Each structure stands twice: as structure tokens, then as C-alpha cells.
């Protein structure tokens, strides 16, 4: 699965750099877009993201594993768009930041696997029709 591998690489590299706080062909352009759009979503939805993080109660490895299981039903209302996808990835970046502060940095990779698993499992057909990561870049171009 070239799409899962590419998406995992994009989401994991984005979440790992957001936690660390330092920035590390199609995937290259997608990452640049995700850095701009993602940081923007985290900045404008910081209060909503704080409430969601407090509600989930992430303190250890198991809490990330429970978040991994509940993740498969995030888009249950049948509304699909790039905005909803970037909101999940941005919230994932927000939870990745919190994981670095609670000394649980090893939890960033399974969190990235779970976010990617849900996008590619429940939204594969949609993502493929949308030209995947090329589509993501073209949609957010300004």
C-alpha cells in the first residue's frame, strides 16, 4: 500500500517535528502545506483542542492505545472534506506536543499509525478520488 506508506511518512514526520519543535517529491510539497495549514488550525482552534485533550485524559502509553481504538469512528457523520482531515492531523500534532511534555515521546509513532490507519481505512476511496496528497496540496494552494 503506497498510499498508506506515503500518508504514514507525511503524518509521522509532521507529528514528530511538532513535538520536537524543529523542522527536519509529492510528500515534500504535502509536508510544506501541512506545516502551513496544520500550524494555522492549531493556532485558531487552541482553546477547542485544549478541551478535547483534557477530556481524553492522556497520561500514559495505554491512553494513546485507547485513543488508537476510538480513532476508527472519528468521521461518523458522513461529512468528508479536506478540512476534516487536516483537523484530525492538527489535533494529532497537538496531542504529540502534550506527549513530549508528559515524557511519553515514544507514543508519537503509534498515534501517527492510528491517525493514518483511520484516514486510509475509512477514507481510501475518497482520498484516491481526491488525487491523494497531490490533491491535498492543490486544494490548499494560495
Amino acid at each position, epitope marked *: 500500500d503506497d498510499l498508506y506508506r506515503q500518508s504514514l511518512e507525511i503524518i509521522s514526520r509532521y507529528l514528530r517535528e511538532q513535538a520536537t519543535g524543529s523542522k527536519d*517529491a*509529492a510528500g515534500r*510539497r504535502a509536508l510544506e502545506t501541512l506545516r502551513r495549514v496544520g500550524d494555522g488550525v492549531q493556532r485558531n482552534h487552541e482553546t477547542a483542542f485544549q478541551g478535547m485533550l483534557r477530556k481524553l485524559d492522556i497520561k500514559n502509553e495505554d491512553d494513546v492505545k485507547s485513543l488508537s481504538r476510538v480513532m476508527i469512528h472519528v468521521f461518523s457523520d458522513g461529512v468528508t472534506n479536506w478540512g476534516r482531515i487536516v483537523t484530525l492531523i492538527s489535533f494529532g500534532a497537538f496531542v504529540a506536543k502534550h506527549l513530549k511534555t508528559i515524557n511519553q515521546e515514544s507514543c508519537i509513532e503509534p498515534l501517527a499509525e492510528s491517525i493514518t490507519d483511520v484516514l486510509v481505512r475509512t477514507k481510501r476511496d475518497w482520498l484516491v*478520488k481526491q*488525487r*491523494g*496528497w*497531490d*490533491g491535498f*496540496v*492543490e*486544494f*490548499f*494552494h494560495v
Partner: single-chain antibody
Amino acid sequence: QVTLKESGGGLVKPGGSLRLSCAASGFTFSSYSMNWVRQAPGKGLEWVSSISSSSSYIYYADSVKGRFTISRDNAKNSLYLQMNSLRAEDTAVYYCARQVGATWAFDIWGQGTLVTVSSVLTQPPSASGTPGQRVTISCSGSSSNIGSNTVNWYQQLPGTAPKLLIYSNNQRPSGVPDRFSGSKSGTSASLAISGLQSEDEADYYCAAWDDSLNAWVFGGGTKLTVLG
């Protein structure tokens, strides 16, 4: 100035090869999907091929599969069309067109290049009216095209290249008067001109993406005449 300019057209014998180029100016080429659309003399618009920004997703019309190869060189702001095993049915003006990322509308078109080798959506062939009158043009599709995706309308004045008139069923780009309006209902769509003007005498085409064909499907076009 945001422009596209096609090159490479000419006379070729059946079975021959020809390579078309499309030069992009005034925009970040590497962030847009690009398409080739052709038009046989006196006939409708036919989508040929499309290529995504990073070349990861390529699509072809059934009528050119295996003979045409689309490619792009982002470093040269260029789009290409390699045409092999050319047939008389390939004679047409070939247009380069830019696709909007958020809507999939073809917002910028080149002037076209003539290649001389020697319809899933339906529309009434003609429509007419007197100035000031209201005219309506329908576009009939099905579940996998108009029933699943948005509709775009293009206007082509005689001797000109097509221009984007409506996008996302009823949205007007800048420069399109409020007299034009669009609507979508079920698998049907319609274009309304409320108060016909002299400049509205043109050919009108509807277009939508087809999920089953994995292709862009254009309507056969409607020739609008403004009597008197």
C-alpha cells in the same frame, strides 16, 4: 498576467507522431493539476487527459488510451502531450487548461493549437431568444457524474477559446455578469441567462467529473443565437 500558450500543432500523416507543449506564465505551475481538451472543427469540447501537480495521478479519455502520453516539467512550467499512432479522428484544436484545486473548474485556457491528421452529458443542440428575454440551457447526466459531483459551464464565443462561466453548480468567477446563473437538481443541471445580450451569442458547454469512467465528461454544447 496568468496565461497558457500551446505549441507543437501541425499537419501529420495517419499513424504519425506529434508532441504538444503548453507554456504556463504568471502562476505557481507546480501547485496545479493540468488538462488537455480538444475540439474537432465545428464540433464540441472533448476532454483528453489530466495530470496532477506532482504527476502522481494521470487520467485519459477512453478514445486516446494507449496512444497519448501526458507529462509535465514543473522546472520549465510546461505541460506535454505525446501523441503516437495518430488517427483522422484526432484532428482538433488542442487546448491546455488549468484546474482550480478547491473546485476542479478549468479556470485558465490557452488559445489552442491545431493538429490536422491527414457525449456522456447531454444538451439541446440549440437555443434562441430576443434581447432582454430569459433563456435556459439544460445538462443531463447520471449518478456517477452530475449526481455525484459539481457542474461547470464554459462559454465559447465564435473564434475564441472556451472561458469559465460557472463553477461548483452556481458560482460565478470574477468578470462573469450576474445575468448568468446555474443550478443542479438530481442528475440534471441548468444554465439561465436572465436578459439576453448581444455578447451572449456563443456555444455553452456543461462538464462534470465521472466517478465510474474516471474521466471528465463534457456536454455536447448548445449554440445560443440572439435574434435581432
